RNA sequence: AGUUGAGAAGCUUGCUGGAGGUAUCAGAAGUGCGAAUGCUGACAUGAGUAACGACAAUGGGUGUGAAAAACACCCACGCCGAAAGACCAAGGGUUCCUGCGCAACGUUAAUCGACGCAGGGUUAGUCGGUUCCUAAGGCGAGGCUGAAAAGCGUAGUCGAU
RNA sequence: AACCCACUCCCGUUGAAAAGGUAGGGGAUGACUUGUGGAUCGGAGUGAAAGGCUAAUCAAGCUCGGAGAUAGCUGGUUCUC
RNA sequence: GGAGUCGGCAAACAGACUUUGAUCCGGAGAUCUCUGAAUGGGGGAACCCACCUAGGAUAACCUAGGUAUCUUGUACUGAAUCCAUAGGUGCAAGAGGCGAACCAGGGGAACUGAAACAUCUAAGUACCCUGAGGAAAAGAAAUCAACCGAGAUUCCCUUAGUAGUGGCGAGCGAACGGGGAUUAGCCCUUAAGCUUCAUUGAUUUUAGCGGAACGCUCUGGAAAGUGCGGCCAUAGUGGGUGAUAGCCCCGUACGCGAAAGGAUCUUUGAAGUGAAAUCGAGUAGGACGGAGCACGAGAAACUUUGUCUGAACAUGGGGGGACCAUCCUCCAAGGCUAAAUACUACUGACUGACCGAUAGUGAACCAGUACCGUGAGGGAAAGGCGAAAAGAACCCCGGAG
């Protein structure tokens, strides 16, 4: 199990967006993820004759590795690590520092 | 077609369900060649169809 | 091929020497023939090719308990 | 001027053909020959 | 012919120029059919599938084109095309 | 670039480069190239020199094009014509036709091409195969022979010219 | 004449060509020429016999192994005092 | 298991799949074209032509099964020829081909060395061929010792480059006696053992699960680097994250884990086999010609056999390196046996005073490829943007180059 998901909030730790938070929009392969309002770039796109184009400058979000954000602690504001706790019938994800789940 | 409820079925009524699916492949291969096929998804819908009531009418026996 | 059908015996392979001490290869042949024996439980011939070894052998021990050993060890005649 | 290569597709199947080498255990020591080499060809 | 050889022989039409004046001019048809298919089966095909009568097929197989390309020399399938001629007045529709 | 030793060499720095290096003393060597008509790659000289592949032969006009000695058409000259014209077989395998192209290929340029990209194109009861039959020859159940592998061969069954 | 050959001169020799070309030359119903298929091969085959030919290779083919054969013979052998 | 997915070169455009559990991983099953031992008959591999039985269609077929050869067994049958023999058909079981090495056998060189070369060497090597197994082979004294004794076979270290052998040249080369690894014997008045089924338990293997501990500050595009202070340790020299991380990620030490397959060891039952009947005769010994013994005919013992001969019967027979006598020690001509030993084409984990793109595999890259040759066969070159494609919108010259 991966203990970095979509739709969760998290905050970036170490890069050129180091304090941001965000949501997370996709995971890709190969360890890197999508985060919602960080990691903007510019696309210059030429726009050929060829079947209509796309445009011109579009500007969209790059993605960055998975190690280089965390999960926010929406009850200390902190960057926090996340276990896996013993499981009855289930696994689920709790915080590292406090152990109640991350929700 | 889910395997659950095709083993409900019998060797009668299963052919006559593989029979219909070859008749749907055949005019989805007339669409492709003609060029009005947009659910391009559908070809390899119907194969596994095929394939699936295959399986269990041997296990019928 | 060169074997006798009672004992076995092929070609076997050695040196001829000169006076020199010169060396050649060589083959050392069995000494057989073929020959018709008389069956008397039968009232046949079988004709076998044997060394004239095997021949002796028959004689001391009989056609019948040749013959059996033969049939035995799966060779045909 | 004759060249010494003057083609037949049936004198070539004749004499280097799969089924010419699998006629003889000789012919059969070179296409285990060529499998061991990875060969793509294997036959003429 | 078993009940599911009938829908396996036809590939779809063949379209072109070449076709498309065979379709008015002379009432013939020009399809892409199975390798293996002979010409009675696809008379006893096109018959059952589109409820018309076929008078005569001709077939003839193409070699496929030889393509090269960086990683070297590629070629695409060998497929057969057949020709159907119908009655002197019926339309054939898919 | 400077500087230090008798030498192999050491040291300090300007510029370039953008992530690794190894004082000292020991231990192990794929440890030091100018030559071997040495091996591999790159680049010189000859030199912008020889040559541009049958000495049948070309001259105008128009068009297209960024650009025409060579492309297309027209007028006019030449050459082959028991072929340098047609058609089968072998061999080759898409070189065939059309649209779009000119970097490379074409011993020059190219708008052209047996060149690149993409489409299209081969329709048989009678043509040629296959199917029937055999020649030379091959293989060959059983068989005979042979250290082993195997050789020869009967019934047979392959093999067109 | 076609077809098969190869006597002479010249050209060509980095060739148009790893054996040709232009002029002349011999045989041209036969011990002829030629297509397709087949058989014989490495101390072996074939040879109207030149030690010729056996895939541009022949007083013993090519290929892979023994094999890094052997070389009292040539050549080379790399920093300092 | 727990949220993304529709393989790569290799991207875009589309169509879809699903927390009612998908892609993905593992066990089991189904399908499995044509060629190839190729096996219905032929063939120029990937092609052509068939026959028989059963079922189904009415036209010019479809579906599913069978049809190679040889060996062994069994049933029917039946030539010359009377009986029965060969021979002929029908069934059952088995085999066939491939594979780098190791093993046991059959055949068997030459270059080279001897500073020439014949005996000799190279060498019973290279190579060709035939069988078997996971190992094979060999194995339970007709053995050595020396008047004291040892006690089946296999492998290692010594004796020892010694005794011998040798155109006595070049060379070849033991044994007795010791030190070790392994431990085991059982049958022909029918045994250990081995194989296959059925059951008693244990252990592994084919996937996975949890898995501790960090902040501030400076330079910087980006801290893991600076400076200060902490925490975890059965986990601290692992890989990578925008520069050098025990505490960011995946891991690591350590604990857990299997519907179902494979394997090994363990019980205790059956069946077969071991198996050759009955203690060994054309055998021991001998003559001629060869091989093997370190031993090349030499005083030449011993083993083996191509040709020819040929005993005795425990008051008998074999050996103790010509041969004789005396002593000593064994019982051939019938069998079966684990371990210690040999090798790696193949799978996994770890390691390296190994290489780092002319190196290391011929081969880091679509390599036994391109290419060369009729064929057997030979056989290359060719890695690196950046942290992230953010891979350069737009204007000008130029042939819409
Ligand atoms: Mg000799
Ligand atoms: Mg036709
Ligand atoms: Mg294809
Ligand atoms: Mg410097
Ligand atoms: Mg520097
Ligand atoms: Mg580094
Ligand atoms: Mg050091
Ligand atoms: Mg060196
Ligand atoms: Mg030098
Ligand atoms: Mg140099
Ligand atoms: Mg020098
Ligand atoms: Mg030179
Ligand atoms: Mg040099
Ligand atoms: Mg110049
Ligand atoms: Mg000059
Ligand atoms: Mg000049
Ligand atoms: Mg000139
Ligand atoms: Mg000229
Ligand atoms: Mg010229
Ligand atoms: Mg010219
Ligand atoms: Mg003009
Ligand atoms: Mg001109
Ligand atoms: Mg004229
Ligand atoms: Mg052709
Ligand atoms: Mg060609
Ligand atoms: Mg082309
Ligand atoms: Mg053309
Ligand atoms: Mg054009
Ligand atoms: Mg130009
Ligand atoms: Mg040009
Ligand atoms: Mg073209
Ligand atoms: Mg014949
Ligand atoms: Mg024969
Ligand atoms: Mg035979
Ligand atoms: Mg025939
Ligand atoms: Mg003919
Ligand atoms: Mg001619
Ligand atoms: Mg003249
Ligand atoms: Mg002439
Ligand atoms: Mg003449
Ligand atoms: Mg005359
Ligand atoms: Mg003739
Ligand atoms: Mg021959
Ligand atoms: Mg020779
Ligand atoms: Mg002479
Ligand atoms: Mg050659
Ligand atoms: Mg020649
Ligand atoms: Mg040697
Ligand atoms: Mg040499
Ligand atoms: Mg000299
Ligand atoms: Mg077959
Ligand atoms: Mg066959
Ligand atoms: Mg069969
Ligand atoms: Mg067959
Ligand atoms: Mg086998
Ligand atoms: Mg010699
Ligand atoms: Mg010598
Ligand atoms: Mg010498
Ligand atoms: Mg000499
Ligand atoms: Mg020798
Ligand atoms: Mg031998
Ligand atoms: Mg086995
Ligand atoms: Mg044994
Ligand atoms: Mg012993
Ligand atoms: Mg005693
Ligand atoms: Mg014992
Ligand atoms: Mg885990
Ligand atoms: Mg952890
Ligand atoms: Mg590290
Ligand atoms: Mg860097
Ligand atoms: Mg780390
Ligand atoms: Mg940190
Ligand atoms: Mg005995
Ligand atoms: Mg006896
Ligand atoms: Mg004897
Ligand atoms: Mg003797
Ligand atoms: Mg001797
Ligand atoms: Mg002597
Ligand atoms: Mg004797
Ligand atoms: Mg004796
Ligand atoms: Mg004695
Ligand atoms: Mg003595
Ligand atoms: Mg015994
Ligand atoms: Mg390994
Ligand atoms: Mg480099
Ligand atoms: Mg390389
Ligand atoms: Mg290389
Ligand atoms: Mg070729």
Not at chain 1, 24 to 48: E, F, Q, S, Y
Not at chain 5, 21 to 37: P, R
């Amino acid at each position: 199990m991966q203990k970095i998901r979509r739709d969760d909030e998290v905050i970036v730790i170490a890069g050129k967006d180091k304090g941001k938070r965000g949501k997370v929009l996709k995971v890709l392969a190969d360890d890197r993820l999508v985060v919602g309002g960080v990691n903007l770039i510019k696309r210059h796109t030429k726009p050929n004759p060829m079947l209509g184009q796309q445009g011109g400058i579009v500007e969209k979000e790059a993605p960055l590795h998975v190690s280089n954000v965390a999960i926010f602690n929406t009850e200390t504001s902190k960057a926090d690590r996340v276990g896996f706790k013993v499981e009855d019938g289930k696994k689920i994800r709790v915080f590292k520092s406090t152990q109640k789940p991350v929700q | 077609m889910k395997a659950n409820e095709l083993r409900e079925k019998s060797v009668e009524q299963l052919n006559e369900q593989l029979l219909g699916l070859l008749r749907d492949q055949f005019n989805l291969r007339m669409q492709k060649a003609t060029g009005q096929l947009g659910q391009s998804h559908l070809l390899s819908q119907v194969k596994r169809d095929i394939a699936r009531v295959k399986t269990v009418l041997n296990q019928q026996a | 091929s060169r074997v006798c059908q009672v004992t076995g015996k092929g070609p076997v392979t050695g040196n001829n020497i000169s006076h020199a001490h010169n060396k050649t290869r060589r083959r050392f042949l069995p000494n057989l023939q073929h020959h018709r024996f008389w069956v008397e439980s039968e009232k046949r011939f079988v004709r076998l090719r044997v060394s004239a070894k095997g021949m002796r052998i028959i004689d001391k021990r009989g056609i019948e308990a040749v013959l059996a050993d033969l049939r035995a060890r799966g060779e045909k005649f | 001027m004759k060249r010494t290569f003057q083609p037949s597709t049936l004198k070539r199947a004749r004499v280097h053909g799969f089924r010419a080498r699998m006629a003889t255990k000789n012919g059969r020591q070179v296409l285990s020959r060529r499998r061991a080499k990875g060969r793509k060809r294997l036959t003429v | 012919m078993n009940q599911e050889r009938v829908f396996k022989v036809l590939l779809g039409p063949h379209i072109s120029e070449k076709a498309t004046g065979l379709a008015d001019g002379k009432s013939q048809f020009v399809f892409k059919v199975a390798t293996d298919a002979t010409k009675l089966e696809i008379k006893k095909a096109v018959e059952s599938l589109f409820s018309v009568k076929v008078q005569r097929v001709t077939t003839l197989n193409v070699k496929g084109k030889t393509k090269r390309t960086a990683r070297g020399l590629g070629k695409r399938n060998d497929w057969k095309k057949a020709y159907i001629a119908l009655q002197p007045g019926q339309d054939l529709d898919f």
